[PDB]
């Protein structure tokens, strides 16, 4: 029961917090346990999307949130599911310049296994709640996000900081794509 079925997927390094980010989005809770995701997994959530015009109309959307593994032992398998999504949450950790340098590898990885070369994407900086342990210059992350012509959001699965916002931005990004049919 719903009007639209939208498929999304989160990819990044292991431990940058994708499973946790997604759980916070569909459960508004926060589980601290790290149990590296085995290959793939996905959670579903029904949501409402309202339109703009000038008012507009409400629409029931059924989200399929794809959560890929970060490890390389699985790189092969994980990338297979990249074509199964309309939009991506490309996230890195704010507390690891490393994961931020891998963001460039991921992008290309996406470009080759997605349904298109330029899918709707949104760059995500996770773990904002720990500024004392932060190591990624905000300007770079913000500039890289402008090189790709992509929205950037510093988030926190913990505080929930923007977790909701970012996701509903990718969504709205995909909704503009569909509507042009």
């Amino acid at each position: 029961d719903y009007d639209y079925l939208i498929k999304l997927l989160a990819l990044g390094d292991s431990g940058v917090g994708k499973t946790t980010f997604l759980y916070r989005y569909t459960d508004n809770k926060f589980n601290p346990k790290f149990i590296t995701t085995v290959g793939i997994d996905f959670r579903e959530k029904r949501v409402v999307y309202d339109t703009q015009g000038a008012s507009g109309k409400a629409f029931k959307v059924h989200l399929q949130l794809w959560d890929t593994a970060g490890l390389e032992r699985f790189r092969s398998l994980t990338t297979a599911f990249f074509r199964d999504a309309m939009g991506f949450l490309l996230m890195f950790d704010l507390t690891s310049q490393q994961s931020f340098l891998n963001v460039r590898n991921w992008m290309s990885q996406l470009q080759a296994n997605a349904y298109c070369e330029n899918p709707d994407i949104v760059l995500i900086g996770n773990k904002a709640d720990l500024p004392d342990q932060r190591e990624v210059n905000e300007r770079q992350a913000r500039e890289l996000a402008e090189k790709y012509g992509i929205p950037y959001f510093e988030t926190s699965a913990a505080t929930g900081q923007n977790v909701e916002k970012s996701v509903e931005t990718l969504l709205d990004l995909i909704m503009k794509r569909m509507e042009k049919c």
């Binding site: 639209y4 079925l5 793939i40 997994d41 996905f42 015009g53 109309k57 398998l77 049919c181």
Partner: protein
């Protein structure tokens, strides 16, 4: 080819599960679209029949056929097919001061909902979708 031998079995067993759920999902989404496409043909053919019953839309809702004077809401024109229908059979559409008739509304959820643009670019770049590919590869057991 995607080579899953590396996968230990507890893992293998897990992946498949996730994949099953995906297939369950796909099945459901195709039947959801079928049903709607079914509703558009039924309602559409009804129009093609009553089409020879002079000026019926003037007094009766184009969808439920109930008489206007008998309702508690107020007649509306579909911004699309410009026929009138009661409040209950109408819907306020996305971008424009106005409304849409229950059929025209489904007609639109279906055109956007199917996502032809997406599934065709997907189909033209790979031969099958993720779970599919991963299913034959998981057959190597």
């Amino acid at each position: 080819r995607l080579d899953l031998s590396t996968l230990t079995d507890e893992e293998a067993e897990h992946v498949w599960a996730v994949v099953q759920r995906d297939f369950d999902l796909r099945r459901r989404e195709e039947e959801r679209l079928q049903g709607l496409k079914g509703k558009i043909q039924k309602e559409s053919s009804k129009r093609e029949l009553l089409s020879d019953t002079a000026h019926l839309n003037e007094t009766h809702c184009a969808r439920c056929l109930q008489p206007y004077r008998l309702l508690l809401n107020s007649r509306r024109q579909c911004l699309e097919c410009s026929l009138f229908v009661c409040k209950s059979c109408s819907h306020a559409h996305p971008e424009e001061q106005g409304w849409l008739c229950d059929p025209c509304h489904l007609a639109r959820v279906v055109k956007i909902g199917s996502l032809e643009w997406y599934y065709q670019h997907v189909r033209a770049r790979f031969k099958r979708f993720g779970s599919a590919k991963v299913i034959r590869s998981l057959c190597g057991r």
